[PDB]
Design an enzyme around this catalytic site. Structure first.
Site, PDB file in Angstrom:
ATOM      1  N   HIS A   1      98.883  24.191  45.422  1.00 60.12           N
ATOM      2  CA  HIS A   1      99.049  23.927  43.983  1.00 60.12           C
ATOM      3  C   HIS A   1     100.357  23.205  43.679  1.00 60.12           C
ATOM      4  CE1 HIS A   1      95.514  26.023  43.007  1.00 60.12           C
ATOM      5  NE2 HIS A   1      96.007  27.210  42.695  1.00 60.12           N
TER       6      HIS A   1
ATOM      7  N   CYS B   1     101.706  37.890  50.839  1.00 61.21           N
ATOM      8  CA  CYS B   1     101.001  37.356  49.682  1.00 61.21           C
ATOM      9  C   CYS B   1      99.517  37.678  49.619  1.00 61.21           C
ATOM     10  CB  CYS B   1     101.207  35.854  49.519  1.00 61.21           C
ATOM     11  SG  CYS B   1     100.395  35.245  47.991  1.00 61.21           S
TER      12      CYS B   1
ATOM     13  N   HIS C   1     105.646  30.703  51.032  1.00 58.41           N
ATOM     14  CA  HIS C   1     106.078  31.987  50.473  1.00 58.41           C
ATOM     15  C   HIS C   1     105.418  33.183  51.149  1.00 58.41           C
ATOM     16  CE1 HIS C   1     102.383  30.716  48.552  1.00 58.41           C
ATOM     17  NE2 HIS C   1     102.126  32.006  48.407  1.00 58.41           N
TER      18      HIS C   1
ATOM     19  N   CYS D   1      98.765  29.290  51.818  1.00 59.53           N
ATOM     20  CA  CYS D   1      98.085  29.858  50.662  1.00 59.53           C
ATOM     21  C   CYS D   1      97.784  28.730  49.674  1.00 59.53           C
ATOM     22  CB  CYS D   1      99.043  30.878  50.014  1.00 59.53           C
ATOM     23  SG  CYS D   1      98.607  31.563  48.380  1.00 59.53           S
TER      24      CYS D   1
ATOM     25  N   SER E   1      98.335  28.641  46.638  1.00 57.32           N
ATOM     26  CA  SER E   1      99.470  28.387  45.742  1.00 57.32           C
ATOM     27  C   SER E   1     100.440  27.349  46.265  1.00 57.32           C
ATOM     28  CB  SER E   1     100.257  29.663  45.469  1.00 57.32           C
ATOM     29  OG  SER E   1      99.444  30.642  44.812  1.00 57.32           O
TER      30      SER E   1
HETATM   31  N1  LIG Z   1      98.129  36.316  41.082  1.00 61.83           N
HETATM   32  C1  LIG Z   1      98.920  36.150  42.305  1.00 61.83           C
HETATM   33  O1  LIG Z   1      99.903  36.769  42.557  1.00 61.83           O
HETATM   34  C2  LIG Z   1      98.471  35.124  43.336  1.00 61.83           C
HETATM   35  C3  LIG Z   1      97.459  34.094  42.922  1.00 61.83           C
HETATM   36  N2  LIG Z   1      96.931  33.118  43.828  1.00 61.83           N
HETATM   37  C4  LIG Z   1      95.946  32.135  43.352  1.00 61.83           C
HETATM   38  O2  LIG Z   1      94.590  32.737  43.817  1.00 61.83           O
HETATM   39  C5  LIG Z   1      93.764  31.687  43.893  1.00 61.83           C
HETATM   40  C6  LIG Z   1      92.928  31.821  45.206  1.00 61.83           C
HETATM   41  O3  LIG Z   1      93.840  31.554  46.269  1.00 61.83           O
HETATM   42  P1  LIG Z   1      93.183  31.385  47.741  1.00 61.83           P
HETATM   43  O4  LIG Z   1      92.266  32.481  48.059  1.00 61.83           O
HETATM   44  O5  LIG Z   1      94.335  31.176  48.745  1.00 61.83           O
HETATM   45  O6  LIG Z   1      92.417  29.986  47.482  1.00 61.83           O
HETATM   46  P2  LIG Z   1      91.156  29.369  48.285  1.00 61.83           P
HETATM   47  O7  LIG Z   1      91.123  27.898  47.942  1.00 61.83           O
HETATM   48  O8  LIG Z   1      91.224  29.795  49.760  1.00 61.83           O
HETATM   49  O9  LIG Z   1      89.815  30.063  47.682  1.00 61.83           O
HETATM   50  C7  LIG Z   1      89.306  29.648  46.420  1.00 61.83           C
HETATM   51  C8  LIG Z   1      87.773  29.756  46.474  1.00 61.83           C
HETATM   52  O10 LIG Z   1      87.374  29.461  45.211  1.00 61.83           O
HETATM   53  C9  LIG Z   1      86.032  28.660  45.417  1.00 61.83           C
HETATM   54  N3  LIG Z   1      85.742  27.915  44.192  1.00 61.83           N
HETATM   55  C10 LIG Z   1      86.383  26.802  43.805  1.00 61.83           C
HETATM   56  N4  LIG Z   1      85.854  26.416  42.638  1.00 61.83           N
HETATM   57  C11 LIG Z   1      84.900  27.306  42.324  1.00 61.83           C
HETATM   58  C12 LIG Z   1      84.041  27.394  41.274  1.00 61.83           C
HETATM   59  N5  LIG Z   1      83.809  26.609  40.104  1.00 61.83           N
HETATM   60  N6  LIG Z   1      83.193  28.388  41.181  1.00 61.83           N
HETATM   61  C13 LIG Z   1      83.120  29.349  42.158  1.00 61.83           C
HETATM   62  N7  LIG Z   1      83.952  29.256  43.246  1.00 61.83           N
HETATM   63  C14 LIG Z   1      84.828  28.231  43.289  1.00 61.83           C
HETATM   64  C15 LIG Z   1      86.302  27.882  46.510  1.00 61.83           C
HETATM   65  O11 LIG Z   1      85.078  27.334  47.184  1.00 61.83           O
HETATM   66  C16 LIG Z   1      87.101  28.769  47.477  1.00 61.83           C
HETATM   67  O12 LIG Z   1      86.380  29.458  48.452  1.00 61.83           O
HETATM   68  C17 LIG Z   1      94.580  30.380  43.763  1.00 61.83           C
HETATM   69  O13 LIG Z   1      94.530  29.901  42.454  1.00 61.83           O
HETATM   70  C18 LIG Z   1      95.966  30.984  44.047  1.00 61.83           C
HETATM   71  O14 LIG Z   1      96.978  30.052  43.545  1.00 61.83           O
HETATM   72  C19 LIG Z   1      97.285  33.253  45.223  1.00 61.83           C
HETATM   73  C20 LIG Z   1      98.147  34.406  45.670  1.00 61.83           C
HETATM   74  C21 LIG Z   1      99.077  35.197  44.740  1.00 61.83           C
HETATM   75  O1  LIG Z   2     100.733  32.701  45.775  1.00 60.21           O
HETATM   76  C1  LIG Z   2     101.847  33.185  45.523  1.00 60.21           C
HETATM   77  N1  LIG Z   2     102.390  33.287  44.290  1.00 60.21           N
HETATM   78  C2  LIG Z   2     101.768  32.785  43.075  1.00 60.21           C
HETATM   79  C3  LIG Z   2     101.658  33.921  42.052  1.00 60.21           C
HETATM   80  C4  LIG Z   2     100.953  33.418  40.806  1.00 60.21           C
HETATM   81  C5  LIG Z   2     101.716  32.279  40.153  1.00 60.21           C
HETATM   82  C6  LIG Z   2     101.907  31.144  41.157  1.00 60.21           C
HETATM   83  C7  LIG Z   2     102.570  31.615  42.458  1.00 60.21           C
HETATM   84 ZN   LIG Z   3     100.319  32.975  47.887  1.00 57.55          ZN
END
Ligand SMILES: NC(=O)C1=CN([C@@H]2O[C@H](COP(=O)(O)OP(=O)(O)OC[C@H]3O[C@@H](n4cnc5c(N)ncnc54)[C@H](O)[C@@H]3O)[C@@H](O)[C@H]2O)C=CC1
Ligand SMILES: O=CNC1CCCCC1
Ligand SMILES: [Zn+2]
Ligand SMILES: NC(=O)C1=CN([C@@H]2O[C@H](COP(=O)(O)OP(=O)(O)OC[C@H]3O[C@@H](n4cnc5c(N)ncnc54)[C@H](O)[C@@H]3O)[C@@H](O)[C@H]2O)C=CC1
Ligand SMILES: O=CNC1CCCCC1
Ligand SMILES: [Zn+2]
Ligand SMILES: [Zn+2]
Ligand SMILES: [Zn+2]
EC number: 1.1.1.1
Lengths: 374, 374
Positions: free
Chosen positions: B51, B174, B67, B46, B48
């Site tokens: 990150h 997740c 995770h 993922c 994250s």
């Molecule tokens: N709130 C929560 O519980 C969780 C939050 N996250 C966060 O969600 C986010 C997405 O995670 P994933 O899908 O695994 O990441 P990912 O990297 O697979 O997808 C992100 C997408 O955003 C696009 N992107 C990047 N910059 C951009 C921009 N300026 N404008 C438009 N599109 C843009 C990318 O081309 C990519 O396709 C991450 O920040 C992750 O840390 C992940 C899972 C749990």
């Molecule tokens: O992707 C899994 N968990 C994330 C949830 C949002 C804060 C950072 C960790």
């Molecule tokens: Zn995650």
């Protein structure tokens, strides 16, 4: 003796920012199609009117401000169907056209006919009905209630109970309805909850009334003017805190008092810092914070979005989320049925000619609402 | 033959930021009371986890990250009642203690036992179960799934259907659940609505899945990588837009396309600017915007609060708002009953030993989810 004619009457003209209102003769044109000319009976002094004087809220000048009021219809234009001469009415600073995408939405109330987002200071047709010394004068929020007579578009006026006491129910035109609805309709305060209310003026006291009506178990009032605490407790606050009394930031104080954050918080001042503080003091996983206060023009706040990622909800609203023309008559009826009180908000009653003294009372911290009588 | 003993196994250790993971031998202590030791079967990559490598998400190093996973209980400590050796399980990066004010709240899920807000990189008791080269290693979010064996607190593990395909259902730990729930539980997308989803990775595709499940009439995917568009349409997007294709800011395009703003918008990237853009593109009086992406550590966004005063709602959530231990087994049951699909999210499969190649695939834009098999 006035229908169809220009009326010469007294009004409070603001010619430029940071000057007293000028009480002098204006000319009020007769209503055009779908317009209503109203003889004012009472109008309240709201902080938003002061924001026009101070430059906090930008709107074209010179202007006749005033938006919280009630009056009696003097005449109606061609095609008006919802009010008649002699009716008691409240002008609506947020219109309800009934036909736009917002009016049609069950949860929207910020009608796209509003004059707030991109203020023109005119009637809906882009022109003004006011002249002073031969000069055109702008309207304010389509209402302009600081005048013995005003002209409003039909979508910006609601007919109310003919037995209504106008010197009280004018507050349903802004302060009461906005604060009350911000608690009961926008935040949707729940029974047994803990609420924090930042700012204890007319709007904040009305928020407190709504939190109490919704069954909140604790209501914490926050104000830097401790003279506001007594009335806040009378209307439902269980405790009051003055940030200036503490060595630590008030968000930390409120989080400790609430054993981890409040359920609902309300910013009812209009400061960027208190908007962020109010969001921060609500519980991080399920708290809700509502912005009511008006921030200074064109200024952005800064905040850490992790405050939202944990689960907080942040929202704002105009006019307590109420669809204006639908809600104002029902709120007047609720008042007449004794369902809420308005006297706690009224600290002063003055003749309209003393408008500047009424603003001095607001600015000095001494008043909640001054009602001006015509 | 391992119960009660230290296990020597392989794990992917992150010794410092911006460096490849080091696949090497670690020592995994046996579980103490109310802890569970799990043989890992599959784990997803993922954003994250990346990150942590980039310093966007700060947690103590050196660390075993990971995770999003599924495995089989190897042994349980004293007092564990909710899983047994041999059960299939999913580790929960958001615990469900069942006893704090958040766990007791009907809408909250960000349990106060979480290791996200003030990260210690330990088990609940403040110590670590991992040693590498004789040195203690931190845990991550109480899960640490980039290891052949891990130890988790009981409140951070859920028992799942014994027939579950672990190489697919790890995504319920997740990416799938977070995106799907952000739509169906946090935003509460309505039938016939228009949604905008910023970011079309694993999380954004799962948001699209939830918007479609909720009956949205239009779902606009937004990404600067046009290679993400084909899969977004396969899972429900009705149209896709690349901001780099336009001379106007994308909030402006989206407001135009939606005849005045969308009903629901989702930030699923992790940039401050797109969080503000996503809020701006939802309808000013009744729109809802949900932050899902993780912002860079300790940075603030700048925004004009008039975006909220008009009536918008802005919120965020962890794990799609789901109470983790109650929800994960029900989500697996729904997957087994074909209520949603996970295959669209899985673009690559690699052995755990090729973890660095899996991160290279994510960083290059080529993958959605790579699943690592142990
Ligand atoms: N709130 C929560 O519980 C969780 C939050 N996250 C966060 O969600 C986010 C997405 O995670 P994933 O899908 O695994 O990441 P990912 O990297 O697979 O997808 C992100 C997408 O955003 C696009 N992107 C990047 N910059 C951009 C921009 N300026 N404008 C438009 N599109 C843009 C990318 O081309 C990519 O396709 C991450 O920040 C992750 O840390 C992940 C899972 C749990
Ligand atoms: O992707 C899994 N968990 C994330 C949830 C949002 C804060 C950072 C960790
Ligand atoms: Zn995650
Ligand atoms: N959203 C809407 O529809 C409406 C918004 N408003 C805005 O609501 C706000 C409140 O209006 P009123 O009650 O009429 O104003 P008010 O001036 O009567 O009350 C404001 C209170 O804030 C207190 N205060 C000022 N600075 C403070 C600080 N740093 N910390 C704590 N307390 C502080 C003041 O002592 C005062 O008691 C104004 O910004 C007004 O423009 C007014 C009505 C409609
Ligand atoms: O007080 C009445 N109306 C206010 C509504 C919020 C913006 C400024 C005007
Ligand atoms: Zn309308
Ligand atoms: Zn007002
Ligand atoms: Zn808990």
């Amino acid at each position: 003796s006035t229908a169809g004619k220009v009326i010469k009457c007294k009004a409070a003209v603001l010619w430029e920012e940071k000057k007293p209102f000028s009480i002098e003769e204006v000319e009020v044109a007769p209503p055009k199609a779908h317009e209503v000319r109203i003889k004012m009976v009472a109008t309240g002094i709201c902080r938003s009117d002061d924001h026009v004087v101070s430059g906090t809220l930008v709107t074209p000048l010179p202007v006749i401000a005033g938006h919280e009021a009630a009056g009696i219809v003097e005449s109606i234009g061609e095609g008006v169907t919802t009010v008649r001469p002699g009716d008691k009415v409240i002008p609506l600073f947020t219109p309800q056209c009934g036909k736009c995408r917002v009016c049609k939405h069950p949860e929207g109330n910020f009608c796209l006919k509003n004059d707030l987002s991109m203020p023109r200071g005119t009637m809906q047709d882009g022109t003004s009905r006011f002249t002073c010394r031969g000069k055109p004068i702008h309207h304010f929020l389509g209402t302009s209630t600081f005048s013995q007579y005003t002209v409003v578009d039909e979508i910006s006026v609601a007919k109310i109970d003919a037995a209504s006491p106008l010197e009280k129910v004018c507050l349903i035109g802004c302060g009461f309805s906005t604060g009350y609805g911000s608690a009961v309709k926008v935040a949707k305060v729940t029974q047994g909850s803990t609420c924090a209310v930042f700012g204890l003026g007319g709007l904040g006291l009305s928020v407190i009334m709504g939190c109490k009506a919704a069954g909140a178990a604790r209501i914490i009032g926050v104000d830097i003017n401790k003279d506001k605490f007594a009335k806040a407790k009378e209307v439902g606050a269980t405790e009051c805190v003055n940030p200036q009394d503490y060595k630590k930031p008030i968000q930390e104080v409120l989080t400790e008092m609430s054993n981890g954050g409040v359920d609902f918080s309300f910013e009812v001042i209009g400061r960027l810092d208190t908007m962020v503080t109010a969001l921060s003091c609500c519980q991080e996983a399920y708290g809700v914070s509502v912005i009511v206060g008006v921030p200074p023009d064109s200024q952005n706040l800064s905040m850490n979005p992790m405050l939202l990622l944990s689960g907080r909800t942040w929202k704002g609203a105009i006019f307590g989320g109420f669809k204006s023309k639908d809600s104002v008559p029902k709120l007047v009826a609720d008042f007449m049925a004794k369902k809420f009180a308005l006297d706690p908000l009224i600290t002063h009653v003055l003749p309209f000619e003393k408008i500047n003294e009424g603003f001095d009372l607001l600015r000095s911290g001494e008043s909640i609402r001054t009602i001006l009588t015509f």
